[PDB]
Design a protein around this nucleic acid. Sequence first.
DNA 1: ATCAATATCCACCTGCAGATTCTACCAAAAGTGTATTTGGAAACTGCTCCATCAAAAGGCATGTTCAGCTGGTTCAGCTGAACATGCCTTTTGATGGAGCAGTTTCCAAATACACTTTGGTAGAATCTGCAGGTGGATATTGAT
DNA 2: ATCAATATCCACCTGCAGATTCTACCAAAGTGTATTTGGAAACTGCTCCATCAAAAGGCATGTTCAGCTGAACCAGCTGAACATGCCTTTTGATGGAGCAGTTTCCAAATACACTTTGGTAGAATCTGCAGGTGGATATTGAT
Lengths: 78, 86, 96, 97, 109, 107, 97, 99
Amino acid sequence: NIQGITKPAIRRLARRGGVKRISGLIYEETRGVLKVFLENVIRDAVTYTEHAKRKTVTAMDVVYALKRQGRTLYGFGG
Amino acid sequence: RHRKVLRDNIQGITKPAIRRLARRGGVKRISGLIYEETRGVLKVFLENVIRDAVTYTEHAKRKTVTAMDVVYALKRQGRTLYGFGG
Amino acid sequence: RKRSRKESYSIYVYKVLKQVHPDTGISSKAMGIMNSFVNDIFERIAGEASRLAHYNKRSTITSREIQTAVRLLLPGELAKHAVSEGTKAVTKYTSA
Amino acid sequence: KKRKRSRKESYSIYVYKVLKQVHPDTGISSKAMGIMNSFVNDIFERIAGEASRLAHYNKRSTITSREIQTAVRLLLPGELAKHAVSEGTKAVTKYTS
Amino acid sequence: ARAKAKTRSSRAGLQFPVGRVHRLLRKGNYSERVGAGAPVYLAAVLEYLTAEILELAGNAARDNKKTRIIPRHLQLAIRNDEELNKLLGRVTIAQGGVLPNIQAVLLPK
Amino acid sequence: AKAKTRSSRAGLQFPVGRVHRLLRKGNYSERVGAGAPVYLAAVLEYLTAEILELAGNAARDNKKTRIIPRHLQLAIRNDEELNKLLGRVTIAQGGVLPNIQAVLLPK
Amino acid sequence: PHRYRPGTVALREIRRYQKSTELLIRKLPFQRLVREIAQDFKTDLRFQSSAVMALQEACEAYLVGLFEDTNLCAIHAKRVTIMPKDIQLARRIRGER
Amino acid sequence: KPHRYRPGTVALREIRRYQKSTELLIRKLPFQRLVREIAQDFKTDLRFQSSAVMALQEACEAYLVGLFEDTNLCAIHAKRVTIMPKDIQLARRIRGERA
DNA sequence: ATCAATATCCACCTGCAGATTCTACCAAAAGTGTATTTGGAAACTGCTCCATCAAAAGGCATGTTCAGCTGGTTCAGCTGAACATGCCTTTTGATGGAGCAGTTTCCAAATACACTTTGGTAGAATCTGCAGGTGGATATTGAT
DNA sequence: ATCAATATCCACCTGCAGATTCTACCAAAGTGTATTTGGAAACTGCTCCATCAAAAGGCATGTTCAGCTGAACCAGCTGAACATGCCTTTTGATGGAGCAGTTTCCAAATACACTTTGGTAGAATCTGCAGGTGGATATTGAT
Ligand SMILES: [Cl-]
Ligand SMILES: [Cl-]
Ligand SMILES: [Cl-]
Ligand SMILES: [Cl-]
Ligand SMILES: [Mn+2]
Ligand SMILES: [Mn+2]
Ligand SMILES: [Mn+2]
Ligand SMILES: [Mn+2]
Ligand SMILES: [Mn+2]
Ligand SMILES: [Mn+2]
Ligand SMILES: [Mn+2]
Ligand SMILES: [Mn+2]
Ligand SMILES: [Mn+2]
Ligand SMILES: [Mn+2]
Ligand SMILES: [Mn+2]
Ligand SMILES: [Mn+2]
Ligand SMILES: [Mn+2]
Ligand SMILES: [Mn+2]
Ligand SMILES: [Mn+2]
């Protein structure tokens, strides 16, 4: 499914990041990095979910997990 | 009494000391403009830590900065230091 | 049955928005950002105040711990103006 | 004329006991021991804090061995989390009986 | 017979809720006791920072000709203010975007 | 009955009563369960054991019978997970790991 | 026929996306990815829609910031083209790898 | 002859030697004077436990060494082996110390 | 630098659907009044350990030579930007129902206090690595 | 391809500063008893979540070539290496500043009972926004 994060999507992200020219190897590198990030956040969000004895991951689980990773997010309940 | 006025002490951090720090850091060659940058950077670092340590000292209504004040300051600056208490 | 009763700072943020910009309103998502903001600074200050009291072997958080916590947490001018507003509020409260 | 002194606690004795278990021949300098005391206090406060936040998020006023376990999963990497959960679960089941 | 109830916030000259903040302080396990002036001081500081951010963000919202502040304006205001940027340096505003910025070397000519 | 320490009941070297007291007096929650200090004591003992294991090894590699902070450093930094756990921590008098970027070596 | 010189449309794109705030990854691929990853941690999970939205906000903001840093590293090596080695330098300095 | 090492040989020798040891690399007294000057600019008539000064010096030197490793990586990135102020600045900017 | 010639962007309108503000109930909560308790400020003052000074002990500052590192220059291979089109994935929008979440209920398990040992700590009294000094062996570097 | 000239390496000693062991108080842990209570556990509403099928609409694909990167070459010059001259830091006592140990009495905290406001949810507004246009601004190529 990681291939679902397409070259144009990654290209737009890079453009918002101010990047003008992009080597072709960037897209796979970027996919790896995004996957590591998601694994890190999701592992904690899910830990929070199991702790609350739920089967549904809630927004707060993600927000708390993000806050632990030093990636605090405003606007989803915390 | 009181001691003599401390001025310009950042300059007591000599070129050879900065060079040794860079050597532990794995640095082989060093531009001549490095020594002033490093001094600058060092002073920012110290200003930042000492400010918090002194705030803790003042809060405790003490006149002496203790090792714990420094350790708490470091811990909040995200620079946790092991080996000095707490 | 009834859903829960949720508290938030929305009404107070709104009051402040009206004081500062009587003409201007605010989107609900913006209001969510501002809520998250108040809760976050809240928890940071209170946490710093908590540690301050524990280091000093004290069980009460007073406006002094809050003040020291503000000095530790806010950059520069923001710290100065917050300490000023805080002392001002406490004084007005005390006399009144 | 009347005299004064006080008492400070630390983990030294327990660290030393563990050191003798894993390395019967080996000792440790006082500075190293200071490093180890800092370590125990540091991990302590991290786990307890994570457990505090956890209990607060879930509207619970008691911190149980479950909160501790989750906090340990949140804070420790991988295999350390696995082995720590083992040692902890083991200690608790042993204690309970 | 009791007198007419006056909120603590009104006694303090504040818009933010002193009573709530005190409750939250007591129930967050920060300490055994909470002094009477502490929630007044903290509520005042929260109000101040909220005001600062709303000041700058309102400027942002109407300079681009809106009467409603949206998250974009909060981002523009926080990031264009060095001290707010510092205070919220490790925070992401959802739907905030970034500041317009192209490295000079990337420009033509 | 004859007093049995909680550490002994749980089979731990770390002090369970002490850990309990520190939990109760640290304001982490209104109440602390009877099982929380046992679990936490055990986890602390475990991480201590892991780190003293690796540092005892570093120490005997340096032909020393006594662990010094340098050995603690070497043990933390040569170990991916301890390095990660203590990634934002400084070991006083620990130094750094021998490492010279290849490009700096003579031709 | 008309043709923009390579780089012109790129700069135009930078301006366009730095001016906007909409999420830049398509929703569904992203969600399918989130669910795969999660199911490697815990099974038969469901997700609130806001939960997925928050994960995507976080991911995009992170990736945008990482691209800014990466681009600074490229500019540093006197190029205007970012490469895997740039992303890695940024990540190693950030203390991520 | 008289003997002379080529530029870089003693430098590499020094790297091996200082990466092998753990001693503080700044002299004690200058560092103390700096600490007291800065502190005195925040609050007057402060005293220091010597542990406090040592703790600041351990923290500072560890910070500076780590920053020099990152700086060196930025030099190597730009195909140089000489660290320059621009390298320190790139390192601090990515670290989010400056922005 | 100019002109054309395009191509894309961006104000400027418009009407109205949806998001915000507005209204009016109503439990929960903040406030009030009175009664007690109590954490910690203030006052003394013992006893660590800090500031201070000057004789030791030992690097730093300084200038000169030149190796080799950096940065400028040139240039072609080839990589990555631009672009045009239809297929395939994403989006959109109803549904049934899974499972959060709302309510309520009792017991295992929490706190609190008294009473009594007992493990932990603080020196005191030993014990013993290893720091620091040396010297000889081996390794490495740079000039012929 | 060899030698010097240095540097590092690597045991070996020996004494004492620092680590371990030893005892003896007491500060806290454990036991016992009595009292409150937090939060599973169980029983259902009702939110929204997963699914699915027919919309749109963005991306995958393949080709042309602009210009970016990386290589190769070279000179200017900067920073390393080193020998010299002596000033600065380290080291060791020691009075006394000021932490830290104690005691105690209030200003300031909690405890408990009783009685306006923030949240909520339709109604009533109003403002962006979606959509469309054309003028504004920008880029490209030929003189
Ligand atoms: Cl107060
Ligand atoms: Cl428990
Ligand atoms: Cl690469
Ligand atoms: Cl530079
Ligand atoms: Mn000064
Ligand atoms: Mn009484
Ligand atoms: Mn008392
Ligand atoms: Mn040359
Ligand atoms: Mn060509
Ligand atoms: Mn059901
Ligand atoms: Mn005993
Ligand atoms: Mn030796
Ligand atoms: Mn109950
Ligand atoms: Mn004395
Ligand atoms: Mn005195
Ligand atoms: Mn009462
Ligand atoms: Mn109201
Ligand atoms: Mn529009
Ligand atoms: Mn038309």
